[PDB]
Amino acid sequence: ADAESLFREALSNKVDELAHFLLRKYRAKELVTKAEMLERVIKNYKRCFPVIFGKASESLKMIFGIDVKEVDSNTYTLVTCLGLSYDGLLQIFPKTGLLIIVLGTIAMEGDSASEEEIWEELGVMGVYDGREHTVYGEPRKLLTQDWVQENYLEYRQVPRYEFLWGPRALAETSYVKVLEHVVRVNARVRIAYPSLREAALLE
């Protein structure tokens, strides 16, 4: 009921309304300009663009592995992170960012990571064997079936189970390119929502 309390609910909802807008833009393979997002998403809170865009771009790079690339002006185009070819749209929710998360988890346990170690990373993010996550789908089936035939992963016995990078994963990115995407994002500038006094000062 409080105004500043209803403010961050409006910002948090414009973050999820811009993100779900850009996903509609990436699926159509169009270009996005700053004028479009102002007029057709955050028409009311335009001067908040550096923070709703910054918190939506960051909510794409890491959730769906989609990168907002400014062509440089004020024009942006949507591509996949580390330049992969798979997203999972066959056009709702890209599964690229979860792939890139699984890859970097093996990249840190060495050549191969145990099935146990993989699930434990996936369990902390709300994705559980035998539970259809809404955005990602069934995890066990998508990890095993989907990414084995796509040649992104390997799944073999003990000599327990384990995961290794596949031929297509090594062809489109590297251990060093993933481990630096993890470092660049772990060292990002963290955006904080503005108060009402702050947001009004910028005018």
């Binding site: 990373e121 902390v124 994002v185 772990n186």
Partner: peptide
């Protein structure tokens, strides 16, 4: 929660 990049 993703414990790769803390977000």
């Amino acid at each position: 929660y993703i414990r790769l990049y803390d977000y």
